[PDB]
Amino acid sequence: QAAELFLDTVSTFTSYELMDYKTFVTYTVYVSMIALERPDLREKVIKGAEILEVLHSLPAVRQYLFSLYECRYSVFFQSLAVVEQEMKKDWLFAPHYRYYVREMRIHAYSQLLESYRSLTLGYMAEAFGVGVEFIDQELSRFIAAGRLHCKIDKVNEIVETNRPDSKNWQYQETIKKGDLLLNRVQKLSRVINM
Amino acid sequence: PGRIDRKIEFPPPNEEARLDILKIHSRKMNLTRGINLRKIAELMPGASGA
């Protein structure tokens, strides 16, 4: 919803609260890179002249966006610790910087890993970002976290993926919300009639 | 002279008074940032508020 309210970046103005219009530009790119998929990124933020010329004044952010779109994964961590570090410093972001980059990692893992099926794990250290055992404990904590749809092999040193159908995960959120609202009207049903 | 109590002249707008009618009347449009309505109010040589 935040990038969707940050849709325009045209009628937005030299405001009092973001006296730099470009600070608003950094905000809408930081939320948009999670909020939308590739189809939109490959139309909206890449071809907007009004969005392009203001990040043209930015050396790091223009690199930070294009490292992801141009499949430059190793420097994407380098700029990522910069953006995450400043976001850690940042007021009104500082509540959720720890939520931001843990999504950015698994999103970047999705972007590279959903291309191949037989990609090995020892390719990602030099090709993607260094540290094999870091990739081990990272990826696992995500397959273990129930996202990042693949299934890593260990003692032959390969990573295998699958494709899930939109029938079990689409079911999962429905049992979440159904049990939640059942708890809700369950509780209010306890509230009324004493 | 005992009949009418006050008579009030309404002038055509100057470069100042053309600008704020652009401001008020330009409210409900979907604009674009950076317009410089001063130039446009200079381009209109005082027709009227209509």
Side-chain angles (χ1 to χ4, degrees), chain A, chain B residues 1-14 17-50:
Chain A
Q1 293 298 111
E4 182 64 32
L5 268 298
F6 291 161
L7 191 277
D8 48 355
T9 68
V10 173
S11 67
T12 64
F13 61 102
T14 63
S15 178
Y16 63 95
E17 58 187 2
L18 293 175
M19 62 178 287
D20 196 4
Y21 182 75
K22 187 172 71 176
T23 50
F24 179 76
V25 172
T26 57
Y27 292 162
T28 184
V29 65
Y30 291 163
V31 66
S32 70
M33 60 181 66
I34 294 175
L36 48 84
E37 198 186 359
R38 193 96 195 236
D40 283 22
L41 203 154
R42 66 106 181 87
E43 191 272 333
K44 188 178 266 79
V45 299
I46 196 69
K47 300 292 181 67
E50 68 277 16
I51 199 67
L52 185 66
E53 294 175 355
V54 290
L55 56 86
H56 183 74
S57 176
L58 291 173
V61 179
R62 187 262 187 197
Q63 189 269 328
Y64 181 68
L65 196 278
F66 292 167
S67 180
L68 189 64
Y69 180 77
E70 293 294 326
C71 295
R72 295 179 180 177
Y73 295 97
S74 181
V75 69
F76 186 72
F77 291 101
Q78 299 299 108
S79 59
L80 182 139
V82 174
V83 177
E84 175 60 20
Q85 199 281 130
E86 184 178 1
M87 187 178 287
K88 178 186 264 78
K89 288 188 182 294
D90 196 4
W91 139 75
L92 171 259
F93 250 115
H96 59 85
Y97 64 96
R98 295 177 64 82
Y99 180 70
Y100 184 83
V101 147
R102 64 174 290 160
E103 182 66 30
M104 293 300 291
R105 292 186 186 91
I106 190 161
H107 182 74
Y109 296 155
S110 67
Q111 182 175 1
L112 187 142
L113 268 302
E114 290 295 329
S115 178
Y116 294 156
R117 63 98 182 262
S118 177
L119 184 63
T120 187
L121 58 96
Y123 181 74
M124 293 176 66
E126 70 278 12
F128 179 77
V130 291
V132 176
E133 68 277 15
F134 181 75
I135 293 168
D136 190 7
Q137 64 184 356
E138 186 82 45
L139 314 214
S140 149
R141 132 99 152 316
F142 286 165
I143 300 171
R147 298 177 65 189
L148 194 143
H149 297 284
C150 69
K151 182 61 68 70
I152 181 168
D153 292 329
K154 296 296 294 177
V155 291
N156 53 1
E157 197 265 327
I158 195 169
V159 177
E160 182 63 31
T161 191
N162 52 359
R163 76 282 298 147
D165 290 330
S166 296
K167 184 60 69 176
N168 298 113
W169 179 70
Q170 192 178 4
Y171 176 73
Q172 188 65 41
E173 56 184 1
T174 60
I175 205 66
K176 297 294 184 183
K177 300 294 184 181
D179 293 331
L180 190 146
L181 191 142
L182 191 144
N183 196 4
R184 179 67 64 193
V185 301
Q186 187 177 4
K187 181 176 72 175
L188 175 55
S189 177
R190 296 292 181 270
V191 167
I192 52 93
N193 196 1
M194 186 180 288
Chain B
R3 181 68 67 190
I4 304 301
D5 297 324
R6 183 175 288 176
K7 295 184 286 186
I8 297 169
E9 195 274 334
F10 288 161
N14 58 3
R18 287 189 300 277
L19 184 62
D20 56 349
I21 304 172
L22 290 169
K23 191 269 302 297
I24 297 168
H25 192 274
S26 68
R27 182 71 66 195
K28 75 278 189 187
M29 298 298 290
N30 193 2
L31 272 308
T32 307
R33 177 71 269 167
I35 187 163
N36 195 358
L37 293 171
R38 182 67 57 84
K39 297 297 295 298
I40 303 166
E42 289 174 353
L43 287 173
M44 290 182 287
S48 68

